[PDB]
Write a protein that binds this ligand. Structure first.
Ligand SMILES: Nc1nc2c(ncn2[C@@H]2O[C@H](COP(=O)(O)OP(=O)(O)O)[C@@H](O)[C@H]2O)c(=O)[nH]1
Ligand SMILES: COc1ccc(CNc2c(-c3ccccc3O)nc3ccc(F)cn23)cc1
Ligand SMILES: [Ca+2]
Ligand SMILES: [Mg+2]
Lengths: 424, 67
């Protein structure tokens, strides 16, 4: 198990997905045209996980870029690292999806999906041992949300034994394109609960607050939020992209993180938060990554309990000190980790730090406090749905009110299920 | 899920067609009711005027046949 196939869908999907390929291409010594001008052999040892080798020792991202309009994807080709992506993997429609889940899932996107699956199958075939798929998308618009979840469903049909990962950007009124976002998100969460093994919940609420409160950006752009997203994505893929004892794969992650199959919504965290000169001591990384202020999902982990945790330290540091500090927070806050999964915190260290920082920590948590996120979206949803507001946009593409009711019910069930283990 | 996905797009087409249909039929309905009404108004106007011509024939045949 090595090769992953990456798909990015919609405005958000392709914006954050572009930053991901920018960040990791720098980490693996690949340049804006595709050539390797590195220095360490550790950079190329598992370059195969995310890149294909090409004619002339070029490395080509195993990346499929999907949108229902060409706006965002002409920007990706324009932008700093655009010329690296394989041009056949740009698969785009013309009319877009108007922030409408139904258009993504049932009408506009249905027209386009079979072409995306031909590129998926192309990349899937020239793979020694495919472990799975990761998708970047938001849940709030129509393409990345509705079409994205349509893809997932199709990929599962054709490759029912491979892993499915999402980086799924959850919406907030604090960073809001349209009033129908809670609808779109609730329709997609219903899909994600059934058809993914792992989902990283990137809440835009949490990114806005990190940007505002902790980084002193008064007027935060999507660029400022995506700076935080690509550093988190860099962190939660480190163990796949580098060595050397942890034979870490997506299946192993799924097995150890997910005690119950529907409860696979991970809260990510990063330390230190940036946009420095003083490197952080291991105690500080350990305090910071576990801090609510450093979570990429707007949930207080003190309101819930940690089912499982996976922590990843980057830089040159004492592993003695890393165990000591990781054991200190467990022993000093033991009520917040479930007694009925012994040794639920697993920690790893990797010598290569990220660009900029001498040392950093990335956190992956399956906390029951994630319910707060689904409760927040369940509330915004009901505010509108109890008066059937804005529904005509969805019923005009053939959807029924019963489908909204179903979806509202699955999410509220998810919330009940997370609440069940907080009290056990 | 795939059969449901086909029911939803079939419904979207069905209802769009239905709107186009009933607008087409509602319109033809009105234009035909209107033309019958307008023609009925003008037919009555002309039939009241032709009833005067025929009363003027009675007055012209009361001067000629009273001498
Ligand atoms: N963090 C982040 N959120 C985004 C970005 N672009 C759009 N969004 C959010 O994504 C949602 C809208 O989805 P979008 O991707 O534009 O729609 P789609 O292209 O139809 O899938 C809203 O919640 C936006 O705030 C981005 O670059 N970064
Ligand atoms: C109870 O928590 C876990 C147990 C096993 C695994 C499997 N592999 C993995 C991972 C890991 C796996 C896939 C992708 C990204 C990752 O960062 N990160 C760690 C860190 C420490 C460690 F011991 C294993 N890790 C994950 C979580
Ligand atoms: Ca069309
Ligand atoms: Mg948008």
């Amino acid at each position: 198990m090595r090769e992953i196939v990456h798909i990015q869908a919609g405005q958000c999907g392709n914006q954050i997905g572009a930053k991901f390929w920018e960040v990791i291409s720098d980490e693996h010594g690949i340049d804006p045209t595709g050539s390797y001008h590195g220095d360490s052999d550790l950079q190329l040892e598992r370059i195969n996980v995310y890149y294909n080798e090409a004619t002339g020792n070029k490395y080509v991202p195993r990346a499929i870029l999907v949108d229902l309009e060409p706006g965002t994807m002409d920007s990706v080709r324009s932008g700093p690292f655009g010329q690296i992506f394989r041009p056949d993997n740009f698969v785009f429609g013309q009319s877009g999806a108007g922030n409408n889940w139904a258009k993504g899932h049932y009408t506009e996107g249905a027209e386009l999906v079979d072409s995306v699956l031909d590129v998926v199958r192309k990349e899937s075939e020239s793979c020694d041992c495919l472990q799975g798929f990761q998708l970047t998308h938001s849940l709030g618009g129509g393409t990345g949300s509705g079409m994205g979840t349509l893809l997932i469903s199709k990929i599962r049909e054709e490759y029912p034994d491979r892993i499915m990962n999402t980086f799924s950007v959850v919406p907030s009124p604090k960073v809001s394109d349209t009033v129908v976002e809670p609808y779109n998100a609730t329709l997609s969460v219903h899909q994600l609960v059934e058809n993914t093994d792992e989902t990283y919940c990137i809440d835009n609420e949490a990114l806005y607050d990190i940007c505002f409160r902790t980084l002193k950006l008064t007027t935060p752009t999507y660029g400022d939020l995506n700076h935080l997203v690509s550093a988190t994505m860099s962190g939660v893929t480190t163990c796949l992209r580098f060595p050397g004892q942890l034979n870490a794969d997506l299946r192993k992650l799924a097995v150890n993180m997910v005690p119950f199959p529907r409860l696979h919504f991970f809260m990510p965290g990063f330390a230190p938060l940036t946009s420095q000169y003083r490197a952080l001591t291991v105690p500080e990384l350990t305090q910071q990554m576990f801090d609510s202020k450093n979570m990429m999902a707007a949930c207080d982990p003190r309101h819930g309990r940690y089912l499982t945790v996976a922590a990843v330290f980057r830089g040159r540091m004492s592993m003695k000190e890393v165990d000591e500090q990781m054991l200190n927070v467990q022993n000093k806050n033991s009520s917040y980790f479930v007694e009925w999964i012994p040794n639920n915190v697993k920690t790893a260290v990797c010598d290569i730090p990220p660009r900029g920082l001498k040392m950093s920590a990335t956190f992956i948590g399956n906390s029951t406090a994630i319910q707060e996120l689904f409760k927040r979206i369940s509330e915004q949803f009901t505010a509108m749905f109890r008066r059937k507001a804005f529904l005509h946009w969805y019923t005009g593409e053939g959807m029924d009110e019963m489908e909204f009711t179903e979806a509202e019910s699955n999410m509220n069930d998810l919330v009940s299920e997370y609440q069940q283990y907080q009290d056990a | 899920k795939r059969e449901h996905e086909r029911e939803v797009i079939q419904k979207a087409i069905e209802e769009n067609n239905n709107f186009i249909k009933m607008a087409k039929e509602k319109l033809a309905q009105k234009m035909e009711s209107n033309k019958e009404n307008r023609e009925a108004h003008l037919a009555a106007m002309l039939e009241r005027l032709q009833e005067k011509d025929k009363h003027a024939e009675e007055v012209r045949k009361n001067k000629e046949l009273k001498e």
